[PDB]
């Protein structure tokens, strides 16, 4: 009963509990794990530096999905790995479940001599299967792009797990491939999505060489505060340069240029 | 020391700051009363009557002051009561001086005359000041009153041209802080933040007197700042014994006595005490105490008080209400307004059509301000510090005009302006503090300021001061106003942050230290005479009478409490202290000690923007701010708005502090009176504190928090976050432009793209264009070009050009422009290199060159980069990615020659018992080294390269080789080469012995002069040369007979090849390898160095066999070296020398603790400064006379004979000191008792690490860079210097190891560990100093076309590290034509400079040939450059006057410095020289080289080392002069030719064409030859005619002088001319005319030119010139040397027909009064 009477409202955003846990995603970086189990292997074994691993683990965030091509080379005459050597940022926004990037692939001078490994992404919650949404992102850009080998492009995911970081890397089958170009369900349970379109590949760490990243040149990756701004037909120039964090003042302005009248 | 103890320092604080009352009882004066009146009570003092005038006490007019001091008292006639008694002790007397008197009795003019003694002494004839040589201190409270004080002291002596002028306070670059000014004002929290900062390259050494105006400031909280400025000034004096008055300005105040001890202050002579008797205007005091408390029934008791006070004074006497803010100000003044018109009494104010209220009401309307308009009719108005100055004049001009009568103002109209009234109100005496977070009292200086504007001076008989308090507080300010308010000391309370600032000082360095300091302090002073109030019994205080133990506990508190907070490093066994760099921020920054602890505790490299904000709000400044619940709705609706998230809740403090920051960057009005007051508070702290943690993360290397810091210091300045626009910080423009772009959602850097049309149409606003199109460009912009240079597989050279790419403009940009380069490794993550840029308005449109190391692991990173960060403006940067996908990296190093275990040689293999006669006694045997090569160097005539450490023996391998030489042919000739003057000089003096005093083997050394070089050359069987002295000779090597000639030509440490001058080194031996290539039989050439990494390329480059290679590495060194790298992590310069003093010390004792020591230093003035650090180091452990191995008479034959005050006292105890300041004198006797193990320490500089010639055992280099006076920054130490310091660590017959610490800064740590250990890489840099070489070998015509400077480059080390190296040279390939298209261009590029300038001609491209432009340049050493301007400005009317201001600009006197510590000596040298200058400034090379210049003609002996100055000046003046010489002939100029060929001579003898000839006979007087024209003598062969037995008188000379007339006589040169003219009669106009010259020497001379004023020893050169002197027109001109017999033939051909008569000059160029001069006629046909 308002008979007594009642109170006022105190109004608190989302994303400065969020911007508070992405301040300690630095503590995830040294406890790395990488998926080994019994998964036999398909052929193609995709090693990770860790360095772009730890900073696009830093510049993440715990809900909100990010995302990263993959471009490498392999060793001289030793063409069953494949040395990851870049990972490029480019205009996106993400939701719990998938990411949204544009249609255009990164095209720059320095990616001329390498070839298109996949894409790299973080999940918040580590699934023993791959997400029915990864297939339908990753087979829709092998349509409109046949650069995308099926037997060469992967799909990592860097899930949150709490206090760590495990990393699963698959594959995607001619079964995933079509099924997944064919998807207009956003769903979490689709229709035609069987485990049968995809399989796991053997991705290691290590600290031999070193990595690289691509940003994009007069605009940033983090457009979550901003998706009016993002449109799937979007084009991008790159510059060599690391990203900024996830909560970066360049990354919502709104709340810096809406505070400023009160 | 021992029995300490910890005391409690807060429990010893007086919490009341200056609200301290410490007498108990106050006394009032009589006819003092006091009423009882509505719930509140009144104190009345009555006005006190002047004293009666003393005995001798007349007022003293202005006319009897000193003439000099009249002008700073124009407008005054006669000096006060004060002023009268203190004008002699202020004039007349250089004592510390105390003045105390009430405000208003005129204490100001009392320091003028103290200001006026001082600069009387810096005056001199020209009318003005030295301002270079003194400089005085102002010392204000209050920031008003010290911008008031500038313009009255800058009126008052602006007839004597001095600046005085406000600090600028914002520039730790660019420090123009004083230089131009003279007496600087300030307050006392920003001299002590001065004089904190070390590096005494600032201006304090120049203060000669300090003005501590108010000083009864140290009874306020403030006060310990005033006990730190005084304590450190005095205890400098003790040091430095340059004494420093002490002036003291005061109020009337008991423990005025105690103050004057505190000043050193003889009570006798500088104490003076003028009760309140002595105010000018008698005040009637009236203290107003309420006993009310509730809190607004108080605000209106106040209100009523108020207003019946204003109605006792309304129509009558003007009325000055004080209040405590710029908001009641406007809420009083309408209070009793509105209070009156609510009793209609406002017709007292203004009359019936008052003459005044019709421009109140007429001015009320241009007021424009709306809270002063209601105001301005009525006859009332306010004034505080937030409207606009307009105002503020507009109110003191008609209150000053008797026209408003109600004034309600706050405290800073009472310090800024000097508007008294007769009735002044203070309402209220209480006022909010963020500080303490709480309402405290106002403080002491305030009310005694604003009750001393009560009465004024003229108008008024008395003045009327009202104070309204609490009546609680009624005692305070009774005693405050009538001299009974003690001054203490506040100072306990900053015990700790004021012991940290001297020990980052080094002032203080152990307990004993600052037992010593604080005895200077107040407070010391204070526990004397009173240390019962202050925590001390009476019991123990004699028990311990001068307070040693107390002040003992007192420092180890502080200490422990430094220690706890990682600022110091305290030992309490020793009770030493040990500086840090984060005690360091502390001090320089203003930091409390509690604050950094806290910063060094949650400062970490992967810091949020959110905990960044949190860390800054802990700081210990805000420990007393608190949230009240009035505040927390307020706060709660910001707190869930901001943009940085706040993690804690609300209830604590350090959550409203963050918020508070926030919303001051978001310029967002608070409401809160303690809110918004709380804020300004954090955030005008905010610019330090975040300064400090800029700082502190930058030098630690963590790359994404510096950029997060720095951009927070520059959002708090600009109050504005990086999501705007960076053009707001453009302040000319109006503010909702920009946010109609920023909402326009699209990048900052597009607009640079786009024209002034199209920017108005994407903002929708095409009415403004071309402003921000301006505004645009006006943005600072860098572009940034870079050149990497691999040095090593591991280490990598990069030259970073940083071009400017925006227009300047001084009202945006100002005097200069700062920026931060950042090179930052592959993930942004650590900063491998920071260096600060600064870039100047005067050079903004040029390129900028930038050089540094960084550091490179083998599996090659993707990329570095570079970050060019502006420090001031918002959103400013540049980041150039530095990528390694094409770097080419040079080859691994070969491993080294083998040191093969031989079998060591004896000197039995020389098998010549003459030969063996030079080492038996010396040494038994070779070392292994030695032996080696012995086969290849003695037995064999290849050309040997033989690559050691330094210290390794190399000098008796190319004794080898000379030995050989004297066999196979005994007259053969040999020149060694050695890159260092000093080098060469010792190894002239040590081959002396050997080769000429034991073999008989005449041995020379090269002068630099080619007048005897090229004679050392002929007789000469050892010519000793450095590169730059050797190149002039070989460059006519075709032509010289002597040159291609020689058997033997060994170059040493020729690793110097990559040094500044190793080019030149480059030049002469690639030479000497071409000469006998164009020739038969080879000259053998042996090459010694350092162990090199490419060492074969130079044996490739030098043509030795593999197997003469002998390329060795620091890992054989005869005698094993113990190296050590001791990291020091401090940034600053002089802060790291004192971190390094203690560990000097402790490295003696631990690895040399009694055989002898060698430390060097990076400055002359550190030499003497550490070697008193060691000896008080050594005497702090009880073990003095230590290094002092002699009985300390057996030194007095020694010590005694040196000029130097401190070298003698040092000696005495064991440890010398040797600089170049120092003597040849003194420098010789140091080294002899090092030797001599007399002495075990010096302290040597880096200057003499080439020219000294004793070895330690130990070698400290304490820092390894020093300061240039010239770019003004510091420069690391060259490589190769490094390693000659190290190779003194070397005794071979008298230890068994040898070892060398390095103290250096932590980054340069793994720089030296990598080229130290290991063999040195060199390259060459020839392709940066062609020009000069390509037109010599184009004069002697071995370069004749573009192919064959293609051909001459071949034969050069930089042709073969251009293959080993590509990208060090900037080549992309190693490819056959990648290097011709390189090396084409590198032709092409330095032959169209040389044409261009007039110096070769270029003949279809192709062809090359010299014109005599160049020939000049080549005969005479001298650069292009020169040259070329030379040309331009060498005219036909030219004199002696312009010929010195032509050799001046030369570029080789662009080298020397300009110390401004010398300006005005050189400014009044202007006024000394003959000759004037025309538009003359100080600050270039340049022209202080004439002053120089025309300084040695007259003789005018001047500093020691402007002497040595112009000794290396003079060393090529001839060489300039002769080059003149050649080029006014050349163009047929007589009269300029022959004024040349006169300036050789006065230079030579350095006298003048005006002054007497007599002036070259030694012992002769300064005026010597006013006895002349009284006995008719004026040439010198007059004295030589004077007859011997008169000639023995006159002179007054000492046989001794007499002697030396003579040999000057005896080889003075008279020549007997004989011309005659060929055919006198077949000469055809056209045809072939010669003139026949015949001398004969007259005499029989030995030796050289006799001219002691002159280094270099000469030889008689000649001039034979025809011409006609009426057509100024030179004919004929010959060069020639004179033995006894020469004939010359001058060949011309005629003009017309007639008579036509010519001169024949005889001209000498080191001899004045020789020139003869026959005329002579040639009938033409
Ligand atoms: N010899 C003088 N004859 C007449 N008036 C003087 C004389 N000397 C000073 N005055 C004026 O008396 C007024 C007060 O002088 P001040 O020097 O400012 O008082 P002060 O309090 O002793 O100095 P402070 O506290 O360091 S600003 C000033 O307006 C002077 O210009
Ligand atoms: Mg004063
Ligand atoms: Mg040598």
Redesign the pocket.
Same mark, same amino acid.
């Given at each position: 009963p308002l008979g007594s009477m009642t109170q006022t409202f105190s109004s608190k955003t989302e994303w400065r509990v969020r911007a508070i846990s992405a301040a300690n995603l630095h503590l995830r970086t040294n406890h790395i794990y990488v998926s080994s189990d019994d998964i036999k292997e398909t052929g193609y074994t995709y090693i990770l530096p860790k360095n772009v691993l730890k900073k696009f683990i830093c510049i993440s965030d715990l809900r909100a999905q990010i995302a990263g091509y993959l471009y490498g080379v392999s060793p001289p005459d030793n063409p069953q790995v494949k040395e990851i050597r870049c990972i490029v940022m480019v205009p996106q926004w993400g939701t719990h479940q998938t990411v949204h990037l544009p249609g255009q692939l990164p095209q720059h001078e320095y990616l001329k001599e390498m070839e298109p490994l996949g894409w790299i992404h973080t999940q918040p919650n580590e699934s023993p299967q791959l997400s029915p949404q990864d297939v339908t992102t990753h087979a829709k850009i092998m349509a409109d792009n046949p650069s995308w080998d099926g037997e060469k492009t992967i799909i990592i995911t860097c899930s949150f797990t709490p206090g760590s970081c495990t990393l699963t890397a698959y594959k995607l089958t001619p079964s995933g491939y079509e099924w997944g170009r064919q998807n207009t369900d956003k769903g979490n349970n689709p229709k035609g999505y069987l485990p049968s379109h995809y399989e796991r590949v053997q991705m290691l760490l290590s600290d031999r060489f070193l990595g690289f990243f691509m940003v994009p040149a007069q605009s940033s990756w983090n457009y979550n505060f901003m998706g009016v701004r993002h449109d799937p037909n979007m084009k991008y120039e790159l510059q060599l340069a690391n990203p900024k964090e996830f909560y970066h003042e360049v990354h919502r302005p709104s709340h810096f240029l809406n505070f400023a009248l009160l | 020391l021992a029995p300490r103890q910890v005391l409690d320092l807060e429990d010893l604080v007086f919490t009341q700051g200056s609200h301290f009352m410490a007498n108990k009882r106050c006394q009032l004066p009589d006819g003092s009363f006091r009423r009882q009146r509505k719930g509140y009570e009144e104190v009345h003092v009555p006005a006190l009557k002047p004293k009666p005038f003393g005995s001798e006490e007349q007022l003293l007019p202005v006319e009897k002051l000193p003439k000099y001091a009249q002008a700073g008292f124009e407008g005054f006639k006669t000096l006060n009561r004060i002023q009268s008694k203190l004008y002699r002790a202020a004039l007349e007397t250089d004592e510390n001086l105390l003045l105390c008197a009430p405000t208003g009795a005129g204490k100001t003019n009392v320091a003028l005359m103290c200001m006026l003694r001082e600069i009387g002494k810096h005056i001199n004839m020209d009318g003005t000041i030295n301002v270079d040589d003194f400089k005085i201190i102002y010392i204000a409270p209050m920031r008003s009153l010290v911008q008031e004080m500038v313009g009255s002291f800058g009126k008052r002596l602006a007839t004597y041209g001095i600046t005085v002028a406000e600090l600028t306070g914002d520039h730790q670059l660019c420090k123009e802080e004083i230089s131009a000014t003279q007496i600087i004002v300030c307050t006392p929290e920003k001299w002590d933040i001065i004089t904190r900062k070390g590096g005494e390259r600032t201006y304090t050494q120049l203060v000669r007197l300090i003005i501590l105006d108010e000083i009864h400031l140290l009874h306020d909280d403030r006060g310990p700042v005033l006990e730190a400025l005084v304590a450190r000034a005095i205890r400098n004096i003790e040091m430095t014994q340059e004494d420093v008055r002490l002036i003291g300005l005061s109020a009337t105040l008991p423990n005025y006595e105690d103050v004057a001890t505190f000043l050193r202050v003889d009570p006798a002579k500088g104490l003076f005490y003028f009760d309140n008797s002595f105010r000018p205007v008698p005040l009637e005091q009236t203290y107003v105490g309420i006993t009310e408390k509730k809190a607004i029934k108080r605000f209106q008791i106040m209100n009523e008080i108020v207003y019946e006070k204003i109605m006792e004074h309304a129509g009558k006497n003007q009325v000055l209400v004080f209040v405590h803010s710029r908001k009641e100000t406007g809420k009083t003044a309408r209070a009793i307004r509105d209070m009156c018109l609510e009793k209609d009494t406002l017709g007292l104010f203004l009359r019936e059509g008052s003459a005044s209220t019709e421009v109140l009401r007429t001015e009320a309307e241009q007021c424009k301000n709306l809270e002063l308009k209601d105001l301005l009719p009525y006859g009332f108005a306010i004034h505080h510090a937030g409207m606009t100055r307009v105002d503020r004049t507009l109110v003191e001009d008609l209150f000053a005009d008797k026209h408003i009568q109600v004034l309600v103002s706050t405290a800073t109209l009472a310090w800024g302006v000097n508007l008294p009234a007769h009735t002044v109100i203070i309402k209220g005496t209480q006022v909010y503090s963020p500080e303490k977070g709480r309402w405290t009292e106002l403080g002491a200086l305030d009310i005694l300021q604003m009750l001393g504007r009560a009465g004024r001076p003229q108008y008024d008989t008395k003045g009327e001061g009202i104070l309204i308090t609490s009546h609680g507080e009624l005692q305070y300010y009774l005693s405050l106003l009538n001299q009974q308010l003690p001054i203490e000391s506040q100072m306990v309370s900053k015990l700790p942050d004021m012991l940290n600032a001297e020990i980052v000082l080094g002032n203080v360095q152990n307990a004993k230290d600052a037992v010593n300091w604080l005895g200077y302090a107040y407070l010391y002073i204070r526990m004397l005479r009173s240390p019962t109030l202050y925590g001390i019994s009476h019991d123990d205080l004699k028990g311990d009478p001068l307070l040693d133990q107390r002040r003992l506990d007192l420092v180890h508190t502080a200490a422990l409490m430094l220690d706890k907070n990682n600022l110091v490093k305290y030992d309490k066994k020793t009770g030493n202290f040990q500086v840090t760099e984060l005690g360091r921020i502390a001090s320089h920054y203003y930091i409390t000690n509690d604050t950094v602890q806290t910063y060094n505790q949650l400062l970490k490299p992967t810091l949020s923007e959110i905990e960044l904000f949190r860390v800054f709000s802990l700081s210990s400044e805000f420990k007393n701010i608190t949230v009240r619940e009035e505040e927390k709705l307020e706060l709660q609706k910001l707190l869930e708005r901001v943009p940085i998230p706040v993690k804690e809740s609300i209830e604590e403090p350090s959550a409203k502090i963050n918020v508070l920051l926030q919303a001051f960057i978001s310029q967002l009005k608070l409401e809160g009176f303690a809110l918004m007051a709380d804020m300004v508070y954090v955030t005008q702290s905010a610019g330090r504190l975040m300064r400090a943690i800029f700082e502190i993360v930058l030098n630690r290397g963590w790359a994404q928090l510096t950029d997060k810091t720095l951009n927070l210091c520059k959002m708090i300045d600009k109050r504005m976050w990086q999501s705007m626009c960076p053009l707001r910080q453009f302040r000319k423009l109006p503010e909702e432009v920009v946010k109609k772009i920023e909402k326009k959602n699209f990048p900052f850097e597009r607009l640079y793209d786009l024209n002034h049309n199209e920017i108005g149409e994407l903002i929708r606003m095409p009415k403004m264009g071309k402003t921000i199109h301006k505004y645009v460009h006006l943005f600072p912009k860098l572009e940034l070009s870079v050149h990497l240079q691999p040095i090593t597989r591991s280490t990598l050279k990069v030259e970073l050009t940083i071009t400017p790419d925006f227009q300047w403009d001084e009202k945006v940009h100002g005097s200069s422009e700062a920026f931060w380069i950042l090179v930052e490794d592959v993930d942004s993550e650590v900063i491998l290199h920071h260096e600060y840029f600064l870039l100047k308005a005067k050079y903004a449109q040029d390129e900028h060159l930038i050089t540094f190391f960084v550091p490179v692991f083998e599996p090659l990173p993707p990329q570095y980069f570079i970050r060019v960060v502006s420090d001031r403006w918002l959103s400013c940067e540049t980041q150039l990615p530095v990528s390694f996908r094409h770097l080419i990296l040079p080859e691994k190093y070969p491993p080294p020659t083998e040191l093969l275990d031989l079998q060591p040689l004896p000197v039995s293999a020389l098998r010549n018992s003459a030969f063996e006669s030079l080492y038996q006694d010396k040494f038994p045997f070779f070392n292994p080294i030695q032996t080696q090569v012995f086969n290849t160097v003695y037995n064999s005539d290849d050309n040997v390269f033989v690559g050691a450490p !330094?210290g390794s023996g190399? !000098?008796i391998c190319a004794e080898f080789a000379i030995l050989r030489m004297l066999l196979q042919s005994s007259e053969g000739r040999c020149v060694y080469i050695?890159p260092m003057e000093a080098l060469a000089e010792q190894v002239y003096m040590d081959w002396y012995e050997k080769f000429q005093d034991r073999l008989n083997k005449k041995v020379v050394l090269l002068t630099g002069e080619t007048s005897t070089d090229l004679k050392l050359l002929g007789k000469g069987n050892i010519i000793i040369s450095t590169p730059e002295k050797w190149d002039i000779l070989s460059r006519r090597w075709k032509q010289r007979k002597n040159v291609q000639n020689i058997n033997l030509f060994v170059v040493?440490?020729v690793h110097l090849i990559g040094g500044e001058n190793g080019p030149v080194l480059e030049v002469i031996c690639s030479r000497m390898r071409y000469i006998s290539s164009q020739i038969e039989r080879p000259i053998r050439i042996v090459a010694?160095?350092?162990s090199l990494s490419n060492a074969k390329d130079v044996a490739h480059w030098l043509g030795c066999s593999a197997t003469s290679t002998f390329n060795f590495h620091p890992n054989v060194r005869p005698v094993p070296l113990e190296l050590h790298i001791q990291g020091f992590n401090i940034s600053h310069t002089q802060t790291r020398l004192l971190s390094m003093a203690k560990p000097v010390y402790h490295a003696i004792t631990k690895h040399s603790p009694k055989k002898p020591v060698i430390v060097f230093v990076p400055s002359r003035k550190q030499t003497r400064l550490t070697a008193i650090d060691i000896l008080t180091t050594c005497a702090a452990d009880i073990q003095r006379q230590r290094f002092l191995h002699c009985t300390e008479k057996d030194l007095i034959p020694y010590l005694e004979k040196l000029s130097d005050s401190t070298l003698k006292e040092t000696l005495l105890n064991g440890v010398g000191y040797l600089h170049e300041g120092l003597s040849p004198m003194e420098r010789r006797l140091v080294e002899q008792l090092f030797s001599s193990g007399a002495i075990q320490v010096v302290v040597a500089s880096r200057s003499l690490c080439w020219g000294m010639n004793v070895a330690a055992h130990l070698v400290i280099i304490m820092d390894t860079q020093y300061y240039n006076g010239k770019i003004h920054a510091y420069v690391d130490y060259p490589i190769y210097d490094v390693l000659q310091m190290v190779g003194h660590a070397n005794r071979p017959l008298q230890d068994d190891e040898g070892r060398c610490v390095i103290m250096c800064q932590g980054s340069k740590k793994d720089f030296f560990k990598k080229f130290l250990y290991e063999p040195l890489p060199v390259e060459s840099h020839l392709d940066h100093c062609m020009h000069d070489h390509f037109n010599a070998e184009i004069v002697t015509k071995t370069i004749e076309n573009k192919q064959d400077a293609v051909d001459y480059l071949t034969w050069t080390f930089l042709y073969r590290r251009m293959t080993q190296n590509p990208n060090y040279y900037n080549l992309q390939g190693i490819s056959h034509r990648h290097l011709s298209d390189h090396l084409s261009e590198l032709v092409e590029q330095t032959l169209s400079d040389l044409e261009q300038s007039k110096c070769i001609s270029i003949e279809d491209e192709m062809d090359v040939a010299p014109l005599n432009l160049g020939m000049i340049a080549a005969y005479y050493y001298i650069n292009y450059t020169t040259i070329e301007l030379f040309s331009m400005s060498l005219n036909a009317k030219t004199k002696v006057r312009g010929l010195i201001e032509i050799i001046s600009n030369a570029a080789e006197y662009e080298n020397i410095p300009i110390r401004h510590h010398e300006d005005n000596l050189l400014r009044q040298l202007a006024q000394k020289v003959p000759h004037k200058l025309n538009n003359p400034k100080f600050n270039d090379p340049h022209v202080k080289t004439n002053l120089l210049l025309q300084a040695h003609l007259s003789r005018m002996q001047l500093s020691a080392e402007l002497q040595s100055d112009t000794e290396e000046i003079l060393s090529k003046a001839i060489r300039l002069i002769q080059a003149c010489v050649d080029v006014l002939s050349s163009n047929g100029w007589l009269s300029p030719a022959l004024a040349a060929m006169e300036l050789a001579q006065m230079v030579t003898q350095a006298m003048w064409s005006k002054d007497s000839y007599l002036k070259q006979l030694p012992h002769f007087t300064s005026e010597h030859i006013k006895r002349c024209t009284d006995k008719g003598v004026e040439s010198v062969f007059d004295i030589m005619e004077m007859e011997d037995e008169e000639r023995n008188a006159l002179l007054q000379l000492t046989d001794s002088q007499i002697a030396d007339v003579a040999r000057f006589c005896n080889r003075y040169p008279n020549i007997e001319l004989s011309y005659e003219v060929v055919d006198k009669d077949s000469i055809r106009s056209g045809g072939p005319v010669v003139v026949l010259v015949q001398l004969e020497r007259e005499e029989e001379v030995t030796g050289p030119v006799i001219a002691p004023l002159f280094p270099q020893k000469r030889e008689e050169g000649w001039w034979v010139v025809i011409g006609d002197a009426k057509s100024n027109s030179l004919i004929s001109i010959k060069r020639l040397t004179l033995q006894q017999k020469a004939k010359v033939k001058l060949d011309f051909v005629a003009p017309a027909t007639g008579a036509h008569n010519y001169t024949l000059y005889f001209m000498s160029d080191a001899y004045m009064g020789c020139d003869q001069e026959y005329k002579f006629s040639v009938d033409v046909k």
């Open positions: - | !330094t190399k !000098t050695t040493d440490e010694l160095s350092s």
